[PDB]
């Protein structure tokens, strides 16, 4: 809800919100990944948010 508490979770596919954080993988050099978010995308580089 608009006034509900903040819940911990992880993003999924097709704007899906997952409540469990278990998609762990070894860190790889030169990381880069686009992820669907709302009506656009979220860009990440070296496992760091970009814009």
């Amino acid at each position: 809800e608009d006034q509900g508490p903040l819940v911990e979770g992880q993003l999924g596919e097709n704007n899906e919100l997952r409540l469990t954080r278990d998609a762990i993988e070894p860190c790889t050099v030169g990381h880069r990944r686009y992820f669907t978010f709302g009506g656009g995308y979220v860009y990440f580089e070296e496992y760091a948010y970009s814009h």
Partner: protein, 50 residues
């Protein structure tokens, strides 16, 4: 067009592949890995020149 891609998350990247003539490619007569008995490649090996 013939391209190679890898999952970049919810989107894919692409790279244009370069062609190679058939005469410039040859398959070896065997796959056997003499350096490691018990290990076998799942695809044949090849030698080629651009």
């Amino acid at each position: 067009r013939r391209v190679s891609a890898r999952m970049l998350g919810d989107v894919m990247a692409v790279s244009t592949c370069v062609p190679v003539a058939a005469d410039n490619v040859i398959v070896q007569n065997s796959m056997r890995i003499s350096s490691r008995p018990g290990a076998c490649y799942s695809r044949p090996l090849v030698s080629f020149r651009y």
